[PDB]
Amino acid sequence: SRIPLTLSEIEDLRRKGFNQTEIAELYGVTRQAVSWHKKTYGGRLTTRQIVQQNWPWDTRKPHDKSKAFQRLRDHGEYMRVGSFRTMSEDKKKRLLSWWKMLRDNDLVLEFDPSIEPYEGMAGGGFRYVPRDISDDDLLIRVNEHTQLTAEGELLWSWPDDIEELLS
DNA sequence: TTTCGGTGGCTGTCAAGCGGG
DNA sequence: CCCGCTTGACAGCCACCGAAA
């Protein structure tokens, strides 16, 4: 009734801006079938997905509900893209504000899976702590729960032109 | 007004299993 | 076997809503 679902067709429709769930709907399969074809045969990772490969912690649900998780993700996306040209006005505003809060109050983000949710962390697991000289350019505290890759060193460091962006 | 946490539903991946070739 | 799917469970993504400033 149609053509076999190949990786190539999925990639073409993705380049045209359709997401994997919509492609599944087009082909009468589950999102998982589209994902499987992409995961098994090497489909193009999105920028966010690339950032995920270098995510420094094993976080589980509901850490994604903490603003620190979301803001750090946005930061990784920025460092990966290198400008705000691909993100919404909201992502930009929130990220710049978060950066300001971290520098002006001289904080870095720490992750410990044992932190239970608390006011101002609906997801729990994260906490802001004072910066140490040993932290260098990182926005995060490296502890026993941190996996920091070479790329992660760039992703989770300040942008080089950070002073100028906030003005 | 605008800021910013909390929240929900949607999106995507992984593991285990099933059926047909 | 292998390859393409489906379930079920879970991790992550992003704009909207509303209170607070």
Could you tell me which of A114, A134, A113, A100 has the C-alpha nearest to residue A56? A113
| Alpha carbon distance A30, A121 (integer Å) | 34
Q: In terms of domains, do A60 and A35 share one?
A: no
Return the SS3 of A83: coil
The residues facing A129 across adjacent strands are A108
Contacts for A104 with CB less than 8 Å, ≥ 6 apart: none
Q: In terms of domains, do A77 and A112 share one?
A: yes
Report CA(A96)–C1'(C18) in Å, whole number: 22
Q: Is the CB of A2 under 7 A from strand C?
A: no
Q: Which nucleotides of B are covered by protein (CB under 7 A)?
A: 3-16
Domain housing A155: 49-165
Q: Which nucleotides of C are covered by protein (CB under 7 A)?
A: 4-16
SS3 content of chain A, % helix, strand, coil (to 5): 50, 10, 45
Q: Is the CB of A49 under 7 A from strand B?
A: yes
- Structural method: X-ray
Side chain identity, residue A20 = Q
Contacts for A54 with CB less than 8 Å, ≥ 6 apart: A76, A149, A151, A152, A155
Q: In terms of domains, do A35 and A61 share one?
A: no
A1 domain residue, yes or no: no
Q: In terms of domains, do A86 and A110 share one?
A: yes
Q: In terms of domains, do A148 and A90 share one?
A: yes
Q: Is the CB of A137 under 7 A from strand C?
A: no
Side chain identity, residue A144 = E
Report the number of distinct structural domains present in chain A: 2
Report CA(A69)–C1'(B20) in Å, whole number: 44
Resolution in A: 2.8
Closest CA-bearing residue to C1' of B7: A65
Q: In terms of domains, do A38 and A102 share one?
A: no
